[PDB]
Structures are given as C-alpha cells and as structure tokens.
Amino acid sequence: GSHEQFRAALQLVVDPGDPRSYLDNFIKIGEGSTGIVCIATVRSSGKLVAVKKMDLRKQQRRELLFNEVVIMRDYQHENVVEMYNSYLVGDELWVVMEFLEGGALTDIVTHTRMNEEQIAAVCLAVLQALSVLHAQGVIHRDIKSDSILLTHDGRVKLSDFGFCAQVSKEVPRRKSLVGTPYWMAPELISRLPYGPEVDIWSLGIMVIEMVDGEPPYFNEPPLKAMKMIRDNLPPRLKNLHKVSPSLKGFLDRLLVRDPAQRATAAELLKHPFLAKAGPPASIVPLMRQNR
Ligand SMILES: COCCNc1nc2ccc(C#CC3(O)CCCCC3)cc2n1-c1ccnc(N)n1
C-alpha cells in the first residue's frame, strides 16, 4: 500500500504520458544514489536532453524525490539546470532536463589548478543562484563539485537538487541529516535545527576543492570525518601559500562555525574578491577537451 500510495502522489505532479514515445538514443553518463542518468534525443526537434531515472523501490527516502520535482517544477534561473518535464514510467520516475555539454566541475578540480579568476567566476555564479534560491526558502543541501555543471562556452549551472528542502515563515529550519559528509556544515552534523546557511559552508568546502583538489578530512572514513568536522575548528587550506588575501578573506566569511555569524549569499555577492571573476570564456581552457 505504501509504494502504490507514492505512485498516486507522483501522478498528481508529474506530466501524464509515456515519454518513451518521443525520446530516443539513450546514453548513460552517470549513476549513484538516486538512480541512473542518461542523455537522449527528442524526435520532434532533434534536441538533446538529459534524463534522470530513479526507481521508487530503491530509495532510502522516497519522499525526497517528491520534494525535488514539485519544488523545481520549472523554477527558472540563468545559473540553475533547467527542468523541462517529469514523468512516471512504470516503477521509475523520469526527470527530463537541460543537457550541459561541459560536464561536471569535479573533473576540473582533480586534473588541473584553477586560478583565482576562474575560482571567482564559479563562486559568483553559485552565489547569484543561491541568493535567489535562499530568498524563496529553498536549501540545496548538497553543494559540491559534483553539483556544478558547465556549458561548452564555460557557463556555470547549479545541479543535483536531489537533497533540496523547502523552509517557510512557519517552518524556517530543517532537522534531517542530509548531504555528503565532507561538505556538511557543523550545525547540521551536530543534529541541530539549521537554515539556508548550511549551503554557504558547503560552498566554502567546495572552494577548498578548487584550491587543494579535495575537501578536508577526505582521507578519513565518512563517520570519523563528520566527528572531526563536528568537534574541530574550521579547516585549513593545505595550499594557503597559493591563495591571495582577497580569497582568504572571502573564504573566512564562509567557514564560520556559528551559522548566525556566517555570511549569506546576498552579502557575499558584494565581496571584493568576486571582482576577480572573469568571463565564462576563462573556464573553457580548463575543460577536458581543451586541455
Ligand atoms: C558530467 O556528467 C555527470 C553525470 N551526469 C549527471 N548526473 C546528474 C545527477 C543529477 C542531476 C540533476 C538534477 C536536478 O535536480 C537539477 C535541477 C532540476 C531537476 C534535476 C543531473 C545530472 N547530470 C547531468 C545533467 C545534465 N547534464 C550533464 N552533463 N549531467
């Protein structure tokens, strides 16, 4: 009864019909927790799209799917991966979305060194997106390099809202333990009521990735690392010598243990460091098929 109850709930928010009628040439490009992600062609237009397929009978939290679809059901931002449609195909949920030909940022931080112009460009894009997302009570809860996709001309788009949540004037905070261990904020790990600020911290951790090539305590087990993040002071850049005072000053506004003292997206947009940010063309040489 439980599973069949969820299907019925989906059918009230997903578009009716079988998308297999107009989609062709599926090619897998990703996998992991939720399900598999493929790209496919639309037969009517010849356009390329990306299709995320999530089996309902394989989710640790089946309700997190509903959240994602009803909350992003055609939200529209220049710096967010646009959703086109959602479908219920058998026991699977299909989310049809924009195809980002540039790939994920993870590929860039593990193979090259980004300069501060390129780091500031990424940050600027993420902040502009988060400022609006937070302004409407939406928390990503999984900001990291995997959640940052690129275009061919190097335009940054925030992706993977599989963990996102909605807060309101009535319910201004969340409680559930959600995200990736290494990028988690301390107030979130310590099992405390948290707000949108948990993304600013994770953004901070992602900045470390762009400099060190990996987040703090990445050598440790997930559980042990979380305990370290919980008890310890803010983490230190292994390549502190490589970063400018401007960046270091910027980063110090992100990795503040007290969520109240930690900066917000709207504030950070006015930081002098973001003036270093360059055009989307500057990201281009970093991409795999250019380097
Ligand atoms: C670079 O390729 C890595 C694997 N591809 C991939 N995995 C994804 C997981 C979740 C979402 C996702 C998601 C959303 O949460 C974003 C907001 C709208 C609803 C779906 C998107 C993923 N992608 C995509 C998608 C498009 N292009 C490319 N290159 N990779």
mmCIF file of C-alpha atoms and ligand atoms in Angstrom:
data_model
loop_
_atom_site.group_PDB
_atom_site.id
_atom_site.type_symbol
_atom_site.label_atom_id
_atom_site.label_comp_id
_atom_site.label_asym_id
_atom_site.label_seq_id
_atom_site.Cartn_x
_atom_site.Cartn_y
_atom_site.Cartn_z
ATOM 1 C CA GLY A 1 0.000 0.000 0.000
ATOM 2 C CA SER A 2 2.878 2.353 0.781
ATOM 3 C CA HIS A 3 4.615 2.094 -2.601
ATOM 4 C CA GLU A 4 1.344 2.316 -4.545
ATOM 5 C CA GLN A 5 0.483 5.356 -2.428
ATOM 6 C CA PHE A 6 3.605 7.172 -3.592
ATOM 7 C CA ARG A 7 2.896 6.394 -7.261
ATOM 8 C CA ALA A 8 -0.526 8.012 -6.824
ATOM 9 C CA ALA A 9 1.109 11.094 -5.323
ATOM 10 C CA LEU A 10 3.552 11.406 -8.248
ATOM 11 C CA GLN A 11 0.748 11.241 -10.811
ATOM 12 C CA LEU A 12 -0.640 14.499 -9.412
ATOM 13 C CA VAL A 13 2.611 16.385 -10.018
ATOM 14 C CA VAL A 14 4.246 14.623 -12.963
ATOM 15 C CA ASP A 15 3.215 15.172 -16.556
ATOM 16 C CA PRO A 16 0.953 12.433 -17.914
ATOM 17 C CA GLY A 17 2.022 10.241 -20.811
ATOM 18 C CA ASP A 18 4.891 7.965 -21.764
ATOM 19 C CA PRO A 19 7.997 9.996 -22.738
ATOM 20 C CA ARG A 20 9.450 6.938 -24.492
ATOM 21 C CA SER A 21 7.153 7.904 -27.369
ATOM 22 C CA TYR A 22 9.290 10.947 -28.204
ATOM 23 C CA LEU A 23 12.702 10.091 -26.701
ATOM 24 C CA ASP A 24 15.384 8.059 -28.478
ATOM 25 C CA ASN A 25 19.061 7.033 -28.375
ATOM 26 C CA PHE A 26 19.635 6.782 -24.617
ATOM 27 C CA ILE A 27 23.267 7.001 -23.466
ATOM 28 C CA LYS A 28 24.262 6.573 -19.802
ATOM 29 C CA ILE A 29 26.543 9.253 -18.324
ATOM 30 C CA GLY A 30 26.068 8.902 -14.573
ATOM 31 C CA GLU A 31 24.763 6.812 -11.690
ATOM 32 C CA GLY A 32 24.950 6.681 -7.899
ATOM 33 C CA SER A 33 22.395 7.137 -5.125
ATOM 34 C CA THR A 34 19.082 8.192 -6.713
ATOM 35 C CA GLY A 35 19.431 6.286 -9.990
ATOM 36 C CA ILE A 36 20.967 6.388 -13.460
ATOM 37 C CA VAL A 37 21.303 9.472 -15.655
ATOM 38 C CA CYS A 38 21.232 9.242 -19.447
ATOM 39 C CA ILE A 39 21.149 11.655 -22.366
ATOM 40 C CA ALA A 40 18.630 11.252 -25.179
ATOM 41 C CA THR A 41 17.265 12.867 -28.329
ATOM 42 C CA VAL A 42 13.799 14.381 -28.759
ATOM 43 C CA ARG A 43 12.373 13.068 -32.045
ATOM 44 C CA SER A 44 10.221 16.113 -32.831
ATOM 45 C CA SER A 45 13.029 18.660 -32.610
ATOM 46 C CA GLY A 46 16.283 16.727 -32.693
ATOM 47 C CA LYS A 47 17.252 18.467 -29.440
ATOM 48 C CA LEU A 48 19.418 16.795 -26.791
ATOM 49 C CA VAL A 49 18.241 16.378 -23.200
ATOM 50 C CA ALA A 50 19.383 14.629 -20.027
ATOM 51 C CA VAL A 51 17.098 12.094 -18.343
ATOM 52 C CA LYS A 52 17.440 11.094 -14.693
ATOM 53 C CA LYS A 53 15.778 7.761 -13.921
ATOM 54 C CA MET A 54 15.040 6.918 -10.290
ATOM 55 C CA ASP A 55 13.488 3.608 -9.260
ATOM 56 C CA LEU A 56 10.959 4.225 -6.484
ATOM 57 C CA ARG A 57 11.702 0.860 -4.879
ATOM 58 C CA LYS A 58 15.383 1.717 -4.349
ATOM 59 C CA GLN A 59 15.243 4.991 -2.403
ATOM 60 C CA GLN A 60 16.351 5.439 1.211
ATOM 61 C CA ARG A 61 13.865 8.309 1.347
ATOM 62 C CA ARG A 62 11.142 8.093 -1.314
ATOM 63 C CA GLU A 63 9.798 11.490 -0.218
ATOM 64 C CA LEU A 64 12.971 13.307 -1.315
ATOM 65 C CA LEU A 65 12.019 12.639 -4.924
ATOM 66 C CA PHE A 66 8.688 14.410 -4.485
ATOM 67 C CA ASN A 67 10.381 17.386 -2.968
ATOM 68 C CA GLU A 68 12.781 17.769 -5.911
ATOM 69 C CA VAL A 69 10.093 17.534 -8.622
ATOM 70 C CA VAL A 70 7.391 19.736 -7.034
ATOM 71 C CA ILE A 71 9.931 22.337 -5.877
ATOM 72 C CA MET A 72 11.939 22.636 -9.105
ATOM 73 C CA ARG A 73 8.928 22.032 -11.371
ATOM 74 C CA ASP A 74 10.077 24.764 -13.736
ATOM 75 C CA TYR A 75 11.911 27.103 -11.472
ATOM 76 C CA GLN A 76 13.955 29.167 -13.926
ATOM 77 C CA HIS A 77 17.388 30.709 -13.381
ATOM 78 C CA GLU A 78 20.281 31.556 -15.702
ATOM 79 C CA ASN A 79 22.598 29.719 -13.287
ATOM 80 C CA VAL A 80 20.477 26.659 -12.496
ATOM 81 C CA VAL A 81 19.973 23.492 -14.557
ATOM 82 C CA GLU A 82 16.528 23.940 -16.075
ATOM 83 C CA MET A 83 13.937 21.209 -15.665
ATOM 84 C CA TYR A 84 11.725 20.529 -18.680
ATOM 85 C CA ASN A 85 9.311 17.825 -17.509
ATOM 86 C CA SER A 86 8.740 14.857 -15.194
ATOM 87 C CA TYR A 87 7.127 11.503 -15.925
ATOM 88 C CA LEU A 88 6.079 8.274 -14.255
ATOM 89 C CA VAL A 89 7.407 5.400 -16.353
ATOM 90 C CA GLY A 90 6.438 2.143 -14.666
ATOM 91 C CA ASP A 91 8.162 1.887 -11.292
ATOM 92 C CA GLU A 92 10.575 4.661 -12.289
ATOM 93 C CA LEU A 93 10.496 8.458 -12.035
ATOM 94 C CA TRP A 94 11.872 10.344 -15.038
ATOM 95 C CA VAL A 95 13.116 13.912 -14.819
ATOM 96 C CA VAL A 96 13.832 15.424 -18.222
ATOM 97 C CA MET A 97 16.230 18.358 -18.091
ATOM 98 C CA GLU A 98 18.731 20.608 -19.855
ATOM 99 C CA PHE A 99 21.902 18.929 -21.167
ATOM 100 C CA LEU A 100 25.151 20.552 -20.009
ATOM 101 C CA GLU A 101 27.774 19.610 -22.589
ATOM 102 C CA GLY A 102 30.707 20.842 -20.488
ATOM 103 C CA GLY A 103 30.484 18.184 -17.777
ATOM 104 C CA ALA A 104 30.956 18.421 -14.008
ATOM 105 C CA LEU A 105 33.361 20.659 -12.084
ATOM 106 C CA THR A 106 34.739 17.594 -10.273
ATOM 107 C CA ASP A 107 36.633 16.670 -13.440
ATOM 108 C CA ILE A 108 38.324 20.083 -13.377
ATOM 109 C CA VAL A 109 39.426 20.202 -9.722
ATOM 110 C CA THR A 110 41.016 16.742 -9.884
ATOM 111 C CA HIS A 111 43.087 17.319 -13.029
ATOM 112 C CA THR A 112 44.096 20.999 -13.099
ATOM 113 C CA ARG A 113 44.779 24.036 -10.915
ATOM 114 C CA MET A 114 42.233 26.847 -11.131
ATOM 115 C CA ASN A 115 43.423 30.441 -10.850
ATOM 116 C CA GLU A 116 41.530 32.963 -8.733
ATOM 117 C CA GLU A 117 39.819 34.498 -11.760
ATOM 118 C CA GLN A 118 38.371 31.080 -12.583
ATOM 119 C CA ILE A 119 37.569 30.299 -8.945
ATOM 120 C CA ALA A 120 35.829 33.659 -8.504
ATOM 121 C CA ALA A 121 33.781 33.081 -11.664
ATOM 122 C CA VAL A 122 32.449 29.796 -10.292
ATOM 123 C CA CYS A 123 31.666 31.323 -6.882
ATOM 124 C CA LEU A 124 29.938 34.349 -8.415
ATOM 125 C CA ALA A 125 27.660 32.053 -10.404
ATOM 126 C CA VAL A 126 26.827 29.854 -7.414
ATOM 127 C CA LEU A 127 26.126 32.877 -5.209
ATOM 128 C CA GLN A 128 23.784 34.538 -7.714
ATOM 129 C CA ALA A 129 21.861 31.268 -7.870
ATOM 130 C CA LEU A 130 21.793 30.727 -4.102
ATOM 131 C CA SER A 131 20.760 34.315 -3.352
ATOM 132 C CA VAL A 132 17.512 33.728 -5.242
ATOM 133 C CA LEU A 133 17.078 30.143 -4.014
ATOM 134 C CA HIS A 134 17.511 31.231 -0.385
ATOM 135 C CA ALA A 135 15.266 34.242 -0.981
ATOM 136 C CA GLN A 136 12.486 31.773 -1.760
ATOM 137 C CA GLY A 137 13.188 29.371 1.102
ATOM 138 C CA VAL A 138 14.979 26.621 -0.822
ATOM 139 C CA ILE A 139 18.097 24.916 0.541
ATOM 140 C CA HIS A 140 20.265 22.837 -1.819
ATOM 141 C CA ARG A 141 21.862 20.765 0.979
ATOM 142 C CA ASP A 142 24.456 19.143 -1.308
ATOM 143 C CA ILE A 143 26.665 21.891 -2.742
ATOM 144 C CA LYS A 144 29.936 20.439 -4.050
ATOM 145 C CA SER A 145 31.911 19.983 -7.278
ATOM 146 C CA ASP A 146 29.623 17.170 -8.459
ATOM 147 C CA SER A 147 26.688 19.585 -8.264
ATOM 148 C CA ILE A 148 28.274 22.135 -10.608
ATOM 149 C CA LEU A 149 27.821 21.581 -14.354
ATOM 150 C CA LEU A 150 29.284 23.538 -17.268
ATOM 151 C CA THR A 151 28.391 24.529 -20.819
ATOM 152 C CA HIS A 152 30.707 24.393 -23.849
ATOM 153 C CA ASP A 153 31.454 28.109 -23.541
ATOM 154 C CA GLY A 154 32.113 27.721 -19.826
ATOM 155 C CA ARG A 155 28.864 28.817 -18.199
ATOM 156 C CA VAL A 156 28.241 27.548 -14.664
ATOM 157 C CA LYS A 157 24.946 25.929 -13.595
ATOM 158 C CA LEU A 158 23.896 24.528 -10.210
ATOM 159 C CA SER A 159 22.682 20.920 -10.424
ATOM 160 C CA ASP A 160 21.514 17.879 -8.414
ATOM 161 C CA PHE A 161 18.695 19.158 -6.206
ATOM 162 C CA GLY A 162 18.036 15.589 -5.091
ATOM 163 C CA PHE A 163 18.574 16.637 -1.485
ATOM 164 C CA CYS A 164 16.922 20.062 -1.502
ATOM 165 C CA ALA A 165 14.319 21.196 1.017
ATOM 166 C CA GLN A 166 11.791 23.988 1.468
ATOM 167 C CA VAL A 167 11.520 26.231 4.513
ATOM 168 C CA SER A 168 8.873 28.849 5.293
ATOM 169 C CA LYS A 169 7.985 31.555 7.801
ATOM 170 C CA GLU A 170 6.231 28.771 9.732
ATOM 171 C CA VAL A 171 8.931 26.114 9.319
ATOM 172 C CA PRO A 172 12.103 28.229 8.952
ATOM 173 C CA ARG A 173 14.518 25.353 9.593
ATOM 174 C CA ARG A 174 15.135 21.683 8.787
ATOM 175 C CA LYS A 175 16.298 18.825 11.014
ATOM 176 C CA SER A 176 17.171 15.847 8.806
ATOM 177 C CA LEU A 177 20.772 14.694 8.280
ATOM 178 C CA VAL A 178 21.209 15.302 4.562
ATOM 179 C CA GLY A 179 24.108 15.709 2.132
ATOM 180 C CA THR A 180 27.669 14.493 1.648
ATOM 181 C CA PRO A 181 29.691 14.008 4.909
ATOM 182 C CA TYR A 182 32.783 16.020 3.919
ATOM 183 C CA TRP A 183 30.833 19.091 2.758
ATOM 184 C CA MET A 184 28.367 19.044 5.652
ATOM 185 C CA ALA A 185 28.075 22.049 7.960
ATOM 186 C CA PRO A 186 28.821 21.529 11.687
ATOM 187 C CA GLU A 187 25.377 22.635 12.935
ATOM 188 C CA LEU A 188 23.921 20.075 10.519
ATOM 189 C CA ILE A 189 26.214 17.270 11.700
ATOM 190 C CA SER A 190 25.551 18.034 15.374
ATOM 191 C CA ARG A 191 21.853 17.327 14.702
ATOM 192 C CA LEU A 192 20.587 20.871 15.231
ATOM 193 C CA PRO A 193 17.851 22.924 13.523
ATOM 194 C CA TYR A 194 19.532 24.574 10.530
ATOM 195 C CA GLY A 195 18.709 27.082 7.807
ATOM 196 C CA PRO A 196 19.985 28.048 4.309
ATOM 197 C CA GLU A 197 23.373 28.881 5.855
ATOM 198 C CA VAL A 198 24.410 25.225 5.565
ATOM 199 C CA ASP A 199 24.938 25.859 1.844
ATOM 200 C CA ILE A 200 27.343 28.750 2.411
ATOM 201 C CA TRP A 201 29.522 26.387 4.441
ATOM 202 C CA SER A 202 29.405 23.705 1.743
ATOM 203 C CA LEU A 203 30.235 26.379 -0.817
ATOM 204 C CA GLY A 204 33.222 27.124 1.389
ATOM 205 C CA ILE A 205 34.263 23.481 1.332
ATOM 206 C CA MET A 206 33.897 23.479 -2.448
ATOM 207 C CA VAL A 207 36.232 26.483 -2.623
ATOM 208 C CA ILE A 208 38.804 24.339 -0.795
ATOM 209 C CA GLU A 209 38.323 21.703 -3.512
ATOM 210 C CA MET A 210 39.173 24.276 -6.167
ATOM 211 C CA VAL A 211 42.411 25.078 -4.331
ATOM 212 C CA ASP A 212 43.538 21.805 -2.716
ATOM 213 C CA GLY A 213 41.928 19.373 -5.151
ATOM 214 C CA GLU A 214 39.925 17.768 -2.341
ATOM 215 C CA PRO A 215 37.832 18.640 0.755
ATOM 216 C CA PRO A 216 39.194 18.444 4.342
ATOM 217 C CA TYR A 217 39.481 15.050 6.078
ATOM 218 C CA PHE A 218 38.904 13.336 2.724
ATOM 219 C CA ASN A 219 41.312 10.578 3.776
ATOM 220 C CA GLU A 220 39.158 9.636 6.758
ATOM 221 C CA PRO A 221 36.071 7.386 6.874
ATOM 222 C CA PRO A 222 32.750 9.246 6.437
ATOM 223 C CA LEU A 223 31.731 8.766 10.090
ATOM 224 C CA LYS A 224 35.109 9.746 11.554
ATOM 225 C CA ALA A 225 35.370 12.785 9.280
ATOM 226 C CA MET A 226 31.965 14.070 10.403
ATOM 227 C CA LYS A 227 33.013 13.776 14.048
ATOM 228 C CA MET A 228 36.153 15.763 13.224
ATOM 229 C CA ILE A 229 34.149 18.488 11.476
ATOM 230 C CA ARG A 230 31.782 18.498 14.454
ATOM 231 C CA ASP A 231 34.411 18.924 17.181
ATOM 232 C CA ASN A 232 37.237 20.815 15.467
ATOM 233 C CA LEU A 233 37.724 24.415 14.403
ATOM 234 C CA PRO A 234 37.316 25.458 10.736
ATOM 235 C CA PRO A 235 39.693 23.519 8.424
ATOM 236 C CA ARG A 236 42.901 24.908 6.923
ATOM 237 C CA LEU A 237 43.935 25.131 3.264
ATOM 238 C CA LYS A 238 46.877 22.838 2.514
ATOM 239 C CA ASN A 239 47.809 25.399 -0.146
ATOM 240 C CA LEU A 240 47.351 28.552 1.934
ATOM 241 C CA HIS A 241 50.535 29.897 0.345
ATOM 242 C CA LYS A 242 48.923 29.843 -3.104
ATOM 243 C CA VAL A 243 45.846 31.931 -2.265
ATOM 244 C CA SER A 244 45.617 35.726 -2.144
ATOM 245 C CA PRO A 245 44.496 37.743 0.910
ATOM 246 C CA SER A 246 41.354 38.557 -1.069
ATOM 247 C CA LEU A 247 40.340 34.888 -1.428
ATOM 248 C CA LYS A 248 41.451 34.034 2.108
ATOM 249 C CA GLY A 249 39.342 36.905 3.406
ATOM 250 C CA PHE A 250 36.416 35.708 1.300
ATOM 251 C CA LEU A 251 36.757 32.103 2.470
ATOM 252 C CA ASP A 252 36.795 33.209 6.121
ATOM 253 C CA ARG A 253 33.259 34.554 5.663
ATOM 254 C CA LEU A 254 32.038 31.099 4.622
ATOM 255 C CA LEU A 255 33.580 28.627 7.066
ATOM 256 C CA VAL A 256 32.248 30.153 10.290
ATOM 257 C CA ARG A 257 31.091 27.583 12.863
ATOM 258 C CA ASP A 258 28.339 29.836 14.213
ATOM 259 C CA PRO A 259 25.673 29.836 11.466
ATOM 260 C CA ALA A 260 24.463 33.224 12.721
ATOM 261 C CA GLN A 261 27.908 34.767 12.215
ATOM 262 C CA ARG A 262 28.363 33.042 8.856
ATOM 263 C CA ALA A 263 27.716 35.230 5.805
ATOM 264 C CA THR A 264 24.758 34.954 3.434
ATOM 265 C CA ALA A 265 24.543 34.693 -0.357
ATOM 266 C CA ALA A 266 23.179 38.237 -0.716
ATOM 267 C CA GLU A 267 26.057 39.639 1.352
ATOM 268 C CA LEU A 268 28.791 37.616 -0.364
ATOM 269 C CA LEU A 269 27.712 38.898 -3.789
ATOM 270 C CA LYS A 270 29.149 42.256 -2.709
ATOM 271 C CA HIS A 271 32.593 40.885 -1.824
ATOM 272 C CA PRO A 272 35.717 42.475 -3.407
ATOM 273 C CA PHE A 273 37.042 39.002 -4.256
ATOM 274 C CA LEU A 274 34.252 38.452 -6.787
ATOM 275 C CA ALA A 275 35.612 41.394 -8.785
ATOM 276 C CA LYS A 276 38.391 38.989 -9.762
ATOM 277 C CA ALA A 277 35.754 36.891 -11.538
ATOM 278 C CA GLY A 278 36.246 36.597 -15.273
ATOM 279 C CA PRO A 279 34.050 35.769 -18.282
ATOM 280 C CA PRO A 280 32.742 32.217 -18.935
ATOM 281 C CA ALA A 281 35.419 32.059 -21.653
ATOM 282 C CA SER A 282 38.086 31.798 -18.937
ATOM 283 C CA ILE A 283 36.685 28.456 -17.762
ATOM 284 C CA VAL A 284 36.885 27.000 -21.286
ATOM 285 C CA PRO A 285 40.632 26.169 -21.287
ATOM 286 C CA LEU A 286 40.114 24.066 -18.141
ATOM 287 C CA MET A 287 37.639 21.675 -19.750
ATOM 288 C CA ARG A 288 38.814 18.166 -20.653
ATOM 289 C CA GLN A 289 38.628 18.529 -24.424
ATOM 290 C CA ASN A 290 40.628 21.744 -24.468
ATOM 291 C CA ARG A 291 43.435 20.957 -22.046
HETATM 292 C C1 LIG B 1 29.015 15.227 -16.165
HETATM 293 O O1 LIG B 1 28.132 14.110 -16.069
HETATM 294 C C2 LIG B 1 27.981 13.593 -14.744
HETATM 295 C C3 LIG B 1 26.729 12.713 -14.690
HETATM 296 N N1 LIG B 1 25.595 13.460 -15.243
HETATM 297 C C4 LIG B 1 24.610 13.918 -14.395
HETATM 298 N N2 LIG B 1 24.311 13.373 -13.241
HETATM 299 C C5 LIG B 1 23.296 14.060 -12.655
HETATM 300 C C6 LIG B 1 22.612 13.900 -11.446
HETATM 301 C C7 LIG B 1 21.609 14.763 -11.110
HETATM 302 C C8 LIG B 1 21.259 15.809 -11.969
HETATM 303 C C9 LIG B 1 20.199 16.708 -11.610
HETATM 304 C C10 LIG B 1 19.346 17.462 -11.332
HETATM 305 C C11 LIG B 1 18.268 18.409 -10.987
HETATM 306 O O2 LIG B 1 17.999 18.337 -9.592
HETATM 307 C C12 LIG B 1 18.686 19.826 -11.384
HETATM 308 C C13 LIG B 1 17.522 20.815 -11.181
HETATM 309 C C14 LIG B 1 16.303 20.364 -11.987
HETATM 310 C C15 LIG B 1 15.869 18.982 -11.506
HETATM 311 C C16 LIG B 1 17.001 17.989 -11.761
HETATM 312 C C17 LIG B 1 21.932 15.983 -13.170
HETATM 313 C C18 LIG B 1 22.951 15.113 -13.527
HETATM 314 N N3 LIG B 1 23.800 15.003 -14.629
HETATM 315 C C19 LIG B 1 23.840 15.829 -15.764
HETATM 316 C C20 LIG B 1 22.709 16.528 -16.203
HETATM 317 C C21 LIG B 1 22.810 17.331 -17.324
HETATM 318 N N4 LIG B 1 23.972 17.416 -17.957
HETATM 319 C C22 LIG B 1 25.030 16.747 -17.525
HETATM 320 N N5 LIG B 1 26.222 16.872 -18.216
HETATM 321 N N6 LIG B 1 24.975 15.968 -16.450
#
